[PDB]
Design a protein around this nucleic acid. Structure first.
Length: 749
DNA sequence: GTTCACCAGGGTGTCGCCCTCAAAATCC
DNA sequence: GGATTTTG
RNA sequence: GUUAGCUGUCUCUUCGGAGGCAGAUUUACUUUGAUUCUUUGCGCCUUUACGUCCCACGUAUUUGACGCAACUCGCGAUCGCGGGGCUGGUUUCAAAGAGGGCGACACCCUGGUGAAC
């Protein structure tokens, strides 16, 4: 019944086949945890190493961004240089970066060369992704640009001229051949201005109320350079509050000048704006002071009101300073007090109709209040990653190529072995794999058994096979490497470390790919940091089969019920049905509502609502895959779906058993059926009546049943339809045939 | 009192676009 | 010998 | 705690091997869902309501934040170093996980201007 149980039961007929195909690989991560609870002295060391890593990353990104902004063709040449098209005698992006930032470095890097080199290796892939994304985005952005231009010549212009409304300014130009960020932002600013014009001028009123109104489209999706968002600094809450304070005071020091020149009409409008929490309470005091003192000029009332507002701000901020900026009710009220003070001070300009000056007067207050209100939310956690590039050894040596080894201290007891990680970053830290009797100079022998690699070279001529190399570990005497104790949980070690069929110490099924140090931190506090170790392992899984199924399973998704199933035979008559996780949508809605009310009442959600939804999505994928796999194993049946995490988990599980083929290179389209997984178009499926073929209620017969279950049964019974009537490219409408086949089957059986 | 447009700030969830070393020669 | 460097 | 395919037993019974119980199943990670019992409290300030009209002064048994101690845990040697106290801890359970980087988009919350209805 378990995913493992049905997976093994499916292996019992996945590796029980006879196929001439090559075995396929699967890449998986173990994701240990660095035991910083029992070994806390590693916290400052790991933090300092990650700090040097981040300093070097920021420095390199500064130069790379200056180079991208200087000119962009040279940057494109550097990032995409190949042996055919080298850049400065370099054949890859990472080679160029290695000489420029390490070999040709002037000042000694504070990072050791291997971590710095791995950083540049990761950064090369980051840059390549950024350039590929620009390449894909630019086409759609040009499409939007042309759409706007052709709308602004014969549709919006014609509408405005035929309805007497003057045409606002024209669109700017994007310079498409060397597309740059600032031109896009200029164009988007114009787009926003004119979309505001169109709704008010036409859809709101004074023109024909056509919802469209030719509102021009935004140009969307242009990528940020690497790190632009990652390393964009934002001030603390206290500093934003100080900025808001000074802005509000500066707006309230110009108030008497604006109130001394009030016409009766403007004064009446100002009274209307504040005619009956910070806004409302100030309105209430406004009414109180109007009624109690009718013998006062508006200047005196505004002066007293703002004095009161700022006295409240005085007490609020005194409380904040004496009790920290974590009393978010106080912060909300203080922010609101400055906001309302500024609004009332700037009211005469707004009421006079000088909105052009009003906006540019409000801009400091607008930005400061936005900053404070945003900082009220808890910032996203900071995550960093340092890679160990490989585990191979120097040929004929047992000497590492890189600075990290997974080690295991096998005990003499059955349930007391230990695992750790050796990491070299400091100078003089060396480990080696040699047998106990093969003595070495300047090294100590240890009880660790180490897992290294041998072979796997990517060079055609140099490409020897990869193999798990293990042996006894010698460490440097003077300066030994750093030990990272591990904590992982039996379900994991049972899976990757000592599996019945693939124990690391006795079998040769897994091969170490690489490693990654990880740090997860709450921004602004490193002393409480979470450190993980991610090791990527690879193994062969059985070759894909050639199954002859007489059972099939249909599944429908996208409703209150995440997944509903309906087992069928080869003829198509139902054998079972049900639904999976029928409470998921309700629980998800409850969590969403809790998040929204937390956002309102206090600004944000402090602890686990942040990741809950995503966790529930993962749990839902697990449950759905379990149910489907158990049914398929029960009936030896391929599953049928409709044309994302659930789909991915299902195909991963089926390929690990040898019943699905992972993506080929290129081949971006997937095969509709690959072993058990079948894919069909969700067309004419959830509408056709089960009892006839046209909560769900039929109109041609009056049948009523569950929409999800009938949809699943229809999907399962529709896979059979294309068996005799294969589809063709260019043709998509097959409702007639489909209905004819369905009714013919219903009549026959 | 709700709807729309626009402006400012922040959060999250999903997707795009990225990867998951070895091995040889030279230098200090 | 260990480290640097380049490269596919 | 479990989400390993083991082992030892009791019955089913002869039929096929097939149901229950006990322990296995190395680590202690990141999660999900049920389920049992349990609301730390003493000051100083602040929030949303009522009066009062803001500062202030009262009063709900109103939202919270700091400090001190009760507890719970980890930690190292009676004491010190750290974490949590309802978005909790705790008992029984029954079930998942391949990770990292950098961006973009979608939605949500608040504020602001204008207009339409």
């Amino acid at each position: 019944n378990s995913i493992h149980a049905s997976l093994r039961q499916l292996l019992a007929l996945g590796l029980s086949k006879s196929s001439s195909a090559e075995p396929q690989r699967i890449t998986r991560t173990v994701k240990f945890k660095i035991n910083t609870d029992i070994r806390p002295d590693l916290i400052p060391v790991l933090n300092r190493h990650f700090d040097f890593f981040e300093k070097f990353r920021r420095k390199v990104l500064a130069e790379l961004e200056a180079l991208w902004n200087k000119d962009q063709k040279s940057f494109q040449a550097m990032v995409q240089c190949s042996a055919k098209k080298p850049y400065q005698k370099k054949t890859s992006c990472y080679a160029w970066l290695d000489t420029h930032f390490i070999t040709e470095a002037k000042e000694s890097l504070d990072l050791p060369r291997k971590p710095a080199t791995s950083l540049l290796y990761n950064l090369s892939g980051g840059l390549k992704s950024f350039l590929t994304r620009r390449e894909t985005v630019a086409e759609d952005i040009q499409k939007r640009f042309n759409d706007n231009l052709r709308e602004w010549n014969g549709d919006l212009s014609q509408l405005a001229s035929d309805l007497k409304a003057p045409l606002p300014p024209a669109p700017p130009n994007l310079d498409f051949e060397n597309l740059i960020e600032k031109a896009i932002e200029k164009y988007n600013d114009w787009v926003g201005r004119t979309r505001a014009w169109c709704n008010l001028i036409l859809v709101q009123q004074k023109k024909v109320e056509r919802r469209d109104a030719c509102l021009p489209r935004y140009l969307k999706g242009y990528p940020g350079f690497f790190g632009s968002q990652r390393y964009a600094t934002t001030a603390g809450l206290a500093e934003n509050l100080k900025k808001l304070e000074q802005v509000a005071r500066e707006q309230s020091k110009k108030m008497p000048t604006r109130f001394a020149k009030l016409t009766p009409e403007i004064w009446t409008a100002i009274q209307e704006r504040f005619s009956p929490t910070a806004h409302q309470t100030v309105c209430l005091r406004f009414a109180a002071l109007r009624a109690a003192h009718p013998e006062w000029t508006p200047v005196q009332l505004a002066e007293e009101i703002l004095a009161g507002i700022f006295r409240g701000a005085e007490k609020l901020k005194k409380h904040l300073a004496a009790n920290g900026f974590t009393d978010r009710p106080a912060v909300i009220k203080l922010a609101n007090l400055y906001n309302v003070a500024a609004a009332f001070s700037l009211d005469p300009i707004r009421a006079a109709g000088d909105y052009i000056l009003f906006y540019e007067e409000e801009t400091p207050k607008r930005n400061a209040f936005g900053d404070v209100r945003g900082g009220l939310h808890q910032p996203s956690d900071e995550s960093a990653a340092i890679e160990i590039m490989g585990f191979g050894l120097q040929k004929e040596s047992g000497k590492p190529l890189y600075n990290g080894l997974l080690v295991c201290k096998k005990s003499e007891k059955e349930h007391d072995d230990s695992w750790a990680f050796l990491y070299c970053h400091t100078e003089g830290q060396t480990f080696e794999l040699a047998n106990e009797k093969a003595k070495l100079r300047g090294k100590l022998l240890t009880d660790w058994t180490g897992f290294a690699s041998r072979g796997g070279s990517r060079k055609k001529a140099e490409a020897s096979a990869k193999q798990l190399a293990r042996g006894r570990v010698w460490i440097s005497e003077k300066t030994p490497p750093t030990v990272l104790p591990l904590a992982f949980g039996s379900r994991q070690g049972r899976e990757y470390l000592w599996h019945f069929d693939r124990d690391l110490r006795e079998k040769n099924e897994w091969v170490l790919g690489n490693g990654r140090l990880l740090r997860i931190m709450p921004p602004g506090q490193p002393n409480a940091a979470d450190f993980y170790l991610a090791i990527t392992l690879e193994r062969q899984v059985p070759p894909l089969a050639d199954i002859k199924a007489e059972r099939f399973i249909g599944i429908a998704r996208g409703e209150a019920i995440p997944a509903a199933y309906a087992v069928i035979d080869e003829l198509g008559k139902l054998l079972a049905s049900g639904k999976i996780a029928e409470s998921y949508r309700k629980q998800q809605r409850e969590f969403n509502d809790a998040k929204r009310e937390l956002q309102r009442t206090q600004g944000g959600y402090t602890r686990w609502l942040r990741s809950k939804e995503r966790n529930r999505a993962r749990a839902l994928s697990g449950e759905v895959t379990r149910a489907v796999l158990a049914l398929a194993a029960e009936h030896r049946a391929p599953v049928v779906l409709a044309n994302q995490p659930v789909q991915r988990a299902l195909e991963q599980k089926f390929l690990e058993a040898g019943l699905w083929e992972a993506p080929k290179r290129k081949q971006k389209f997937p095969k509709k059926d690959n072993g058990f997984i079948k894919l069909i178009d969700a067309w004419w499926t959830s509408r056709t009546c089960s009892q006839c073929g046209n909560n769900f209620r039929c109109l041609k017969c009056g049948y009523e049943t569950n929409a999800a279950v009938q949809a699943a049964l229809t999907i399962a019974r529709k896979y059979l339809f294309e068996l005799e009537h294969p589809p063709k490219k260019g043709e998509k409408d097959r409702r007639l045939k489909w209905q004819a086949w369905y009714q013919e089957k219903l009549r026959t059986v």
